[PDB]
Amino acid sequence: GPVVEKIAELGKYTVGEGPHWDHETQTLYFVDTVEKTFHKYVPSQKKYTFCKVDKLVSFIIPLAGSPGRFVVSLEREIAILTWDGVSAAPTSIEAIVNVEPHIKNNRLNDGKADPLGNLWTGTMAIDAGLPIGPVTGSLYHLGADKKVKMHESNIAIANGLAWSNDLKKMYYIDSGKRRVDEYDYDASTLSISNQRPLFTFEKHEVPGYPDGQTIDEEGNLWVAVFQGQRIIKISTQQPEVLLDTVKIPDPQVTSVAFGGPNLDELYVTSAGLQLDDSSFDKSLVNGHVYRVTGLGVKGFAGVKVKL
């Protein structure tokens, strides 16, 4: 089957997350959502660097047309970070907008640009919990004149996002619902409607919780399963179709991104954070980064945020 390789040079992460593959520089960026640090990995040169800040972070995406600048989350703020990619702190930080100025215990979580370059991101309680905890998150996109628009609320744990190739569908994961939802996506108005379940974990005996996701060129979704020790491949052509399962040694798989020179290697982040309600003993929970080859599919390069 597919070959799953632990990336030794990268070490262990508390909650590694938000992988972004920059295809022109052949570079993987990612975050640790509890340790307040950004990470850069260049596989062809075996080069690893990091950057520390003093706010919780959850995504890092290159700014379109601005080498050396990134759009990031800092607690509840969307900001532009200027970073040379090697120094241990940012050169400067430019705040764009605070998405929830008066919800003091919320944070931004997963964020991703749609194929047109619009940033989408969701919030959640800092003390959110599974299976039950405070439900306080919403789904936003960053639109004209640096103002956000709200598209969904009552989100427990805002997580992975993806869009179909023809720009008619959006896929979204609230981990607390243990399902992947699909929406009709209107690219001209950037609005979503007709929410319905695409894939429900309970119907297929899939353990754990859906976390990050990414779509391949054939339109299949690859979904990280937190507390599932796996990634799964699900159809977008028909509801409730499990196409394949790939086991990952780390139980707490958090996200996925296609990368490599031909976009046919799947990079997989995980969490070493040891939780008190785990289905897995502490010795199993490490937080390594993995590379999966031999999946027989290609993905897309990560999209830069347009501002």
* Contact (Cβ atoms closer than 8 angstroms) between residue 182 and residue 170: yes
Task: Residue 138: name its binding partner from Hg ion, Mg ion, none (Cβ under 5 to 8 Å by kind).
Answer: none
Least separation in angstroms between CB 89 and Hg ion: 9
Tell whether 211 is in a known binding site: yes
Tell whether 281 is in a known binding site: no
Closer by beta carbon to Mg ion, 157 or else 198: 157
| Closest chain position to Hg ion (CB) | 83
CB burial readout 13-48, b (16+ within 10 A) else e:
bebbbbbbbbeeeebbbbbbbbbbbbbbbebeeeee
Closer by beta carbon to Hg ion, 68 or else 117: 68
Closer by beta carbon to Hg ion, 95 or else 116: 95
Least separation in angstroms between CB 63 and Hg ion: 11
Closer by beta carbon to Mg ion, 69 or else 158: 158
Which of 110, 211, 216, 250 is flagged as catalytic?
A: 211
Count, in order, helices (H) and strands (E) of the chain: 0, 24
Question: Which spans of this chain sit near Mg ion (rule: CB under 5 A)?
Answer: 110, 159, 211-212
Task: Residue 73: name its binding partner from Hg ion, Mg ion, none (Cβ under 5 to 8 Å by kind).
Answer: none
Task: Residue 292: name its binding partner from Mg ion, Hg ion, none (Cβ under 5 to 8 Å by kind).
Answer: none
| Closest chain position to Mg ion (CB) | 159
> Which of helix, strand or coil describes residue 288?
coil
Element (H, E) at 124: strand 119-125
Least separation in angstroms between CB 15 and Mg ion: 8
Least separation in angstroms between CB 278 and Mg ion: 17
Closer by beta carbon to Hg ion, 71 or else 248: 71
Tell whether 159 is in a known binding site: yes
What is the C-alpha to C-alpha distance for residues 96 and 71, in angstroms, rounded to an integer? 9
What is the C-alpha to C-alpha distance for residues 60 and 181, in angstroms, rounded to an integer? 24
What is the C-alpha to C-alpha distance for residues 127 and 2, in angstroms, rounded to an integer? 36
What is the C-alpha to C-alpha distance for residues 186 and 272, in angstroms, rounded to an integer? 38
Q: What DSSP string describes 175-242?
A: GGGTEEEEEEEETTTTEEEEEEEEEEGGGGT--SEEEEEEE-TTS-EEEEEETTTEEEEE-SSSSS-E
From residue 218, give the alpha-carbon distance in Å to each of 96, 221, 292: 35, 9, 18
CA dihedral 258, 260, 265, 266 (to 10 degrees): -40
Least separation in angstroms between CB 226 and Mg ion: 8
Radius of gyration of the chain (CA): 18
Closer by beta carbon to Hg ion, 37 or else 220: 37
Task: Residue 51: name its binding partner from Mg ion, Hg ion, none (Cβ under 5 to 8 Å by kind).
Answer: Hg ion
Question: Which spans of this chain sit near Hg ion (rule: CB under 5 A)?
Answer: 38, 51, 81, 83
Task: Residue 110: name its binding partner from Hg ion, Mg ion, none (Cβ under 5 to 8 Å by kind).
Answer: Mg ion
Tell whether 17 is in a known binding site: yes
Q: Is 211 a catalytic residue?
A: yes
What is the C-alpha to C-alpha distance for residues 218 and 165, in angstroms, rounded to an integer? 9
Task: Residue 211: name its binding partner from Hg ion, Mg ion, none (Cβ under 5 to 8 Å by kind).
Answer: Mg ion
- Known binding-site residues equal 17, 107, 109, 127, 159, 211
- Known binding-site residues for a divalent metal cation equal 17, 159, 211
- Catalytic (active-site) positions: 211
- Known binding-site residues for substrate equal 107, 109, 127
